[PDB]
Paper text:
Site-specific incorporation of non-canonical amino acids into proteins in response to specified (e.g., UAG) codons has been achieved by pairs of an engineered aminoacyl-[name] synthetase (aaRS) and [name], including the pairs of pyrrolysyl-[name] synthetase (PylRS) and tRNAPyl (CUA). The PylSc-type PylRS from the [name] [name]-G1 ([name]-G1 PylRS) is highly similar to MaPylRS with 64% sequence identity, while [name]-G1 PylRS and MaPylRS both share around 38% sequence identity with M. mazei PylRSc. The genome of the [name] [name]-G1 encodes an [name]-G1 PylRS protein consisting of 273 amino acids, which is quite similar to MaPylRS. The following residues Asn60-Asp273 constitute the catalytic domain, with the characteristic topology of the class-II aaRSs: an extended six-strand, anti-parallel β-sheet (β3, β4, β5, β6, β7, β8) surrounded by α-helices.
The crystallization of the [name]-G1 PylRS protein was successful when using PEG3350 as the precipitant, and the crystal structure of the [name]-G1 PylRS apo form has been determined at 2.78-Å resolution. The asymmetric unit contains ten molecules of PylRS (five PylRS dimers, A/B, C/G, D/F, E/H, J/I). In the [name]-G1 PylRS structure, the residues from Met1 to Pro58 contain two α-helices (α1 and α2). The structures of the ordering loop (residues Ile97-Gln106) and the motif-2 loop (residues Lys150-Glu159) are quite similar in the ten PylRS molecules, while the β5-β6 hairpin (residues Thr195-Ile212) adopts open and closed conformations. Tyr204, at the tip of the β5-β6 hairpin in [name]-G1 PylRS molecules A, C, E, F, and J, is located far from the amino acid binding pocket (the open conformation), while in [name]-G1 PylRS molecules B, D, G, H, and I, Tyr204 is located inside the amino acid binding pocket (the closed conformation). Interestingly, the [name]-G1 PylRS structure revealed that the His225 residue (corresponding to His227 in MaPylRS) undergoes drastic conformational changes in accordance with the location of the Tyr204 residue (corresponding to Tyr206 in MaPylRS) in the β5-β6 hairpin. On the one hand, when Tyr204 is far from the amino acid binding pocket (the open conformation), a π–π stacking interaction is observed between the imidazole ring of His225 and the indole ring of Trp237. On the other hand, when Tyr204 is located inside the amino acid binding pocket (the closed conformation), the imidazole ring of His225 shifts and is stabilized by a π–π stacking interaction with the aromatic ring of Tyr204. In [name]-G1 PylRS, the Met128 side-chain protrudes into the amino acid binding pocket, which would reduce the pocket size as compared with that of MmPylRSc. Based on the crystal structure of [name]-G1 PylRS, the β5–β6 hairpin may exist in a dynamic open-closed equilibrium, and the location and conformational change of the His225 residue appear to be important for the catalytic activity.
Numbering used by the authors:
A (entry chain B), B (entry chain A): 2 to 273
Write the structure that this text describes.
């Protein structure tokens, strides 16, 4: 009728990924006996995991990116690296001004610049100017950090790695093209997935993708209301994936902070 | 007698990397003509390269990073991805206070966090805590962007991709280990280089790296002076390279803004 306290679960959740939610005990002394035994059990397995990294070096995040890069490369996508700084006017083009709920989540650098909370601003600009240099499909994507202000015990990261791809002039059907790129992304992760195409009024069609019943991304297809503000006048398709959450699901990790850019974790193992 | 306008020089440096500094003409009529013809020629050459990226997608920055990654991995290095936010305490351990000349160019987020202007802060903590998990050599490196406030003359970038490697607990001669790693990076970019080794102290030895008599990097081997502030008490080696300036020298670009993270350049070609 008693189990772990609120701060000894926190140590077990830092060195291990298993759910100690309902592991009951006889008394307050029996709960302390297994905590110390399990706390050292995870601590030493966490130690041997990093010893394996030192013997067989690798970076889980880089390895995943390079597989996504080479799958999208077979489809004819150009990888671009856009700046992290974005303008106040670019954010205003995406309806993101003071009345928008995402406005208070924005890290401002000066009165005119901020850290990008998404890739749409820079990809809208790049994909349109590429249209000036070709009459065929524009296929670009980017992998890099975006930033948002968050609650401090919230599960969401303040800096997270986003993968956003977009095709601006599909030679085939734009929705079928996006579904095929989804499958390319999922095979790089190694998981199977569920897709559910659903209607919407502000896009032409929406594609909700989910892994094990958990929605992880939603793609758009067709002309959007914000297109004329970016001088875009053709049907397009695109979707964004959070890469830390994908690693967390593939590796059964406790939370997204264990797989992202961090000074306390490395390939999922704790450093201190 | 007469030579190019300053406005004409800027136009030709935005579409080409050729030096039109010392070309002279008869008078204004002949100067205004070669400009219009060179400008039109550079544009279609710039256009022809963008069409080649569309026909054969690539990204010179990713292509170089991965080549560096796989050469360092053969040496037993571990790629780590650390956060971009850093505390003002972590900077203070690096003597980056109001006293320091780097303080003025620091991008602050709030009063206790800033955007990293170098990789030393985060690499200090990851290399030290990995000592708690092995007795042999500690080898890590990061490829990521750091931020510094620059003036509007702006021939240094505000966001630049830094490559910083660290070898701790040498396992051999640390200086020749560093000499070798430099050759690995230089073979990845594909340039002939020279070295210059001077004696900082009885403890540390510095090594300067120049490409075409232009210094591109500075490294130190031994017990660094800021080690006690990070609980580090053993010799190590490290050096950082600007990935943009390296790409600028190999491809002969006119300035590093054509090779970095940009919305106007894509593999060195202008988009607008």
């Amino acid at each position: 009728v008693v189990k772990f306290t609120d701060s000894q679960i926190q140590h077990l959740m830092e060195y291990g990924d298993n759910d100690w939610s309902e592991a009951e005990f006889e008394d307050a002394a029996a709960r302390d006996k297994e905590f110390s035994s399990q706390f050292s059990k995870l601590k030493s397995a966490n130690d041997k995991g990093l010893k394996d990294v030192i013997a067989n070096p690798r970076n889980d995040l880089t390895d995943l990116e390079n597989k996504i890069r080479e799958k999208l490369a077979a489809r004819g996508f150009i990888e671009v690296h856009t700046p992290i700084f974005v303008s106040k006017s670019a954010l205003a083009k995406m309806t993101i001004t003071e009345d928008h709920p995402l406005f208070k989540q924005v890290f401002w650098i000066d009165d005119k610049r901020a850290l990008r909370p998404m890739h749409a601003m820079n990809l809208y600009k790049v994909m349109r100017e590429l249209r000036d240099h070709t009459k065929g499909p524009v296929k670009i994507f980017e992998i890099g950090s975006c930033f948002r202000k968050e609650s401090k015990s919230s599960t969401h990261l303040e800096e997270f790695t986003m993968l956003n791809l977009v095709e601006m002039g599909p030679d085939g059907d734009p929705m079928e093209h996006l579904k095929m790129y989804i499958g390319d992304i999922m095979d790089a992760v190694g998981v199977e997935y569920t897709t559910s195409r659903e209607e919407s009024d502000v896009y032409v069609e929406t594609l909700d993708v989910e892994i094990n019943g958990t929605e992880v991304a939603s793609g758009a297809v067709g002309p959007h209301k914000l297109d004329p503000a970016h001088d875009v006048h053709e049907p397009w398709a695109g979707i964004g994936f959070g890469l830390e959450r994908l690693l967390m699901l593939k590796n059964g990790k406790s939370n997204a902070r264990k797989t992202g850019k961090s000074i306390t974790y490395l390939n999922g193992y704790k450093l201190d």
